[PDB]
Design a protein around this ligand. Sequence first.
Ligand code: NAD
Ligand code: NAD
Ligand code: CL
Lengths: 365, 365
Amino acid sequence: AVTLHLRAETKPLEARAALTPTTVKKLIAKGFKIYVEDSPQSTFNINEYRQAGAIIVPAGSWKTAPRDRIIIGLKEMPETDTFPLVHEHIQFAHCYKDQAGWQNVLMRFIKGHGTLYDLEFLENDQGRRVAAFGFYAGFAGAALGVRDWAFKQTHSDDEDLPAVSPYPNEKALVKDVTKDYKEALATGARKPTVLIIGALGRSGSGAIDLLHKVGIPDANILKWDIKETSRGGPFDEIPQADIFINCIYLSKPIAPFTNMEKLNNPNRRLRTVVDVSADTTNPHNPIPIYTVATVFNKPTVLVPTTAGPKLSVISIDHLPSLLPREASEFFSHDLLPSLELLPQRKTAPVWVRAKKLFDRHCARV
Amino acid sequence: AVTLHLRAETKPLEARAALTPTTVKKLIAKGFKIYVEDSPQSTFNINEYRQAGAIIVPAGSWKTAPRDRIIIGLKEMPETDTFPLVHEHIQFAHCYKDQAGWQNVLMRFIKGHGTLYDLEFLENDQGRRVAAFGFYAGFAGAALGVRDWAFKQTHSDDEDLPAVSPYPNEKALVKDVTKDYKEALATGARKPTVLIIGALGRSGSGAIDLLHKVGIPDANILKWDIKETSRGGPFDEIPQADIFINCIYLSKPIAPFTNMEKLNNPNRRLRTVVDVSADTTNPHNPIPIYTVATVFNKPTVLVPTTAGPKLSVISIDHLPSLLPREASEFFSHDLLPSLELLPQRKTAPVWVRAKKLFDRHCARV
Ligand SMILES: NC(=O)c1ccc[n+]([C@@H]2O[C@H](COP(=O)([O-])OP(=O)(O)OC[C@H]3O[C@@H](n4cnc5c(N)ncnc54)[C@H](O)[C@@H]3O)[C@@H](O)[C@H]2O)c1
Ligand SMILES: NC(=O)c1ccc[n+]([C@@H]2O[C@H](COP(=O)([O-])OP(=O)(O)OC[C@H]3O[C@@H](n4cnc5c(N)ncnc54)[C@H](O)[C@@H]3O)[C@@H](O)[C@H]2O)c1
Ligand SMILES: [Cl-]
């Protein structure tokens, strides 16, 4: 009879939810009791949770909720808040990797006799995260990649892709990319060849998924993972592709995929780099041709080349925000097996690892 | 505007389908035209396919269907069919690994100018299968493993687990297993510990799923993969578990996981071994404790031991046939993205690889 209480998000702009109406309903089928906070920034209507069996409660009511409820939320809590945290919480606390005030954070739990299970460290036994936002970052990344290539075909070099905003569902995004894509083809541009390094992961998968839905031929989509890069870069297949999408979780050092001298070639076809990895400050960044982390309001940045057509990078570090409903559905569904195991949290190693990680980190203050 | 024609299976006791009413409905929405044969032996009611929007046609219609329709089936043609095969066919034809009659099968295509796209060699660019039957193999294996362990609590050593028969659905199989599991716990047996090697793969995840659905604590389920076995065998944890489920894909020699010397021990708790891999014939076999390939009517074989309690092996090589419905849903769902590229089969690499494989084996006659 586990009880869960979905905290409304307070980080501004944040529209994703850690439980969606669909998983709330699955959870109720399993005998969970579920409270959901009314949150007007959430991309899900409160009515959808109500049809699903949720008990609707006011925003912020977690604070005064009985200490049997598990508080589940997605992003970290207000800085303004300094009161002791008494419940077990599930959330991204962003305090395990020395982000300043991480001690304040843990202090509030220590003083409350409260527990943090950190979404970011829910792993299976082999070290893979159970729930991440990969797919839709890759999906959204690819989609702006296409809109950027398309914009370069229909507008002069001195206009940049304008400021982009989130979409209420996937079908609305695909229609808009599709429209821009068809406009590009009317100018006589060749359909893009799109190179994806790291294609077998979550984001690679989403990228590929977007491209199909948009209508780029399958043979136009090159799908590289470990074995295709193993010789080491730079790779000639990068300047030659129209769009290059870097998905990939960087760990090892690794040689660069491409560099300024290979890209300064008047035979270069590459219009658009979409760095889903966005490991820009890393000293082994496989694509060191840019520095700016782009954002929604300014989604692309020029790569100053001496030769070839105008080349731009997308390096948004918050891509799944483009599609909050779908990023929330896939993530909640990724999380749900482990949620089903909350009645066993005191012995299930997914939950025990996360409690021990918490223990290890409190010992550090 | 592809047309697909779902052929009725003729292989004795084959109840699965390559397309389910559910993927038919998704394919129709992408603008495919789908005809479904009305099947005596299929686990789906023809109404389900009719209400998904298939056109219903008699058994055997594919034989004279126009050559615009792609004929999709699951298993092999009757050995006794000799007429020329004129269509594009998608199925498991089993003639690429030199099975007796492989030329005869190919000859039927050569005489007819047909084309085989073999379901078994449908793979991505990194050489991994797009669609296999792993999950419900592991799920059905685990059910049978838990049901054997339990039988050994409630019955005597001279009795073996009774013959099993396909189930109409998951819930039914789960209700049986749960009941037998509940009775076994009344005898004061310890909740079993189940070790799964190959846990991360398709069959591993199926095995984990069943175990959860029957209420085996997550902490009792030891989920091992490539990392956990690198030190190499034998492994002391195998004799110490109640149940061991081998879900590995075996691709090179590796030291055995266990052996009779280690099994021949007063202290051993291991009661039931489920070899889902069922690589009995292979020299690399990592559990060579048994020689017999068990079957539904006789699903365990005795392992003779000189010490410890009664031990059995389950080595059924057609586990997915016990849940033909679910097995079909999961297969058809995995194959679905590939079926969506059929308009592009002449250039989509996944299909071009299969056409290429076919032209290679044809040249061989
Ligand atoms: N920009 C964003 O908004 C955003 C959002 C979420 C995640 N991410 C980031 O995206 C990256 C990947 O996410 P993911 O979930 O898809 O990881 P993932 O593990 O699922 O995929 C990583 C893939 O890249 C492959 N790979 C690793 N190194 C490689 C190399 N040298 N050459 C070729 N292939 C290689 C891996 O084998 C794997 O298939 C991570 O850095 C993640 O933090 C970014
Ligand atoms: N018995 C049946 O009815 C039936 C039906 C389908 C498949 N299978 C068999 O199932 C086996 C696996 O099927 P799958 O779809 O789960 O394969 P899979 O590739 O999806 O997963 C195989 C897993 O084994 C792991 N692994 C490989 N070698 C290992 C080792 N030495 N130690 C530990 N882990 C190892 C891999 O990392 C992978 O996670 C295959 O041999 C297939 O032939 C049997
Ligand atoms: Cl073209």
